[PDB]
């Protein structure tokens, strides 16, 4: 059994994105899809789709990267340079608006998960709320 999907997902991704994989399915779930809905939306993967491997419902996350490179090492730049499940269980992490951070001087996001749904930080300030600090991409 997983001990915490969210985190797991983020990783499957993390682990996949690092070998320049076309796609990496992640076991389907109400939440997640969400995170991706953003993750994706926010231009951090062409998006994701619902695929049933073994009739078992998953989520194909469609990773993406930059272009090939010069000189020694033609591996494209990573689109998702960073990712970290901040509030894991075993040590929960809630923060209130004025508590939300500035992921990477603002070139990176944070994913709060308020009572107004899951949302980025700039979006948290928007509806001016705070919640449980989830992953943190940039």
């Amino acid at each position: 059994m997983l001990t915490d999907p969210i985190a797991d997902m983020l990783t499957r991704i993390r682990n996949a994105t690092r070998v320049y994989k076309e796609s990496t399915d992640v076991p389907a779930s109400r939440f997640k899809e969400e995170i991706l809905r953003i993750l994706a939306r926010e231009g951090f993967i062409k998006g994701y789709e619902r695929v049933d491997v073994d009739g078992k419902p998953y989520l194909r996350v469609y990773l993406k990267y930059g272009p090939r490179r010069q000189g020694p090492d033609p591996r494209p730049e990573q689109v998702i340079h960073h990712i970290r499940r901040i509030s894991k269980p075993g040590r929960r992490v809630y923060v209130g608006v004025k508590e939300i951070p500035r992921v990477r001087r603002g070139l990176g996001i944070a994913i709060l998960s308020t009572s107004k749904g899951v949302l980025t930080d700039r979006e948290a300030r928007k509806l001016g709320v705070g919640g449980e600090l989830i992953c943190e991409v940039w």
Partner: protein, 104 residues
Amino acid sequence: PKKVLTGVVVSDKMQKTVTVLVERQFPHPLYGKVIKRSKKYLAHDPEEKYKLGDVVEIIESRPISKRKRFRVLRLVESGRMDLVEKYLIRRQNYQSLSKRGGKA
């Protein structure tokens, strides 16, 4: 706001009064996780109404005896010493882990 409290009736075997467990959560002051601490209040029960393994309410009150300053505002729900059993056991192991250890 005279304090009120939901908790459990871990023990009655005394006169007119009762023992109450009252779990509690709150963030570790420094390590963030939410620790789930506990405390045994003594509520004053007259008709000896409330019984073992009862969820109930406690209320701040005018003394009745030292180590005894609350009362039973109500019965949240009956039957469920599953919580007691635990309490019971918590202190069960105890006495054993002195120079030899609890048990299981």
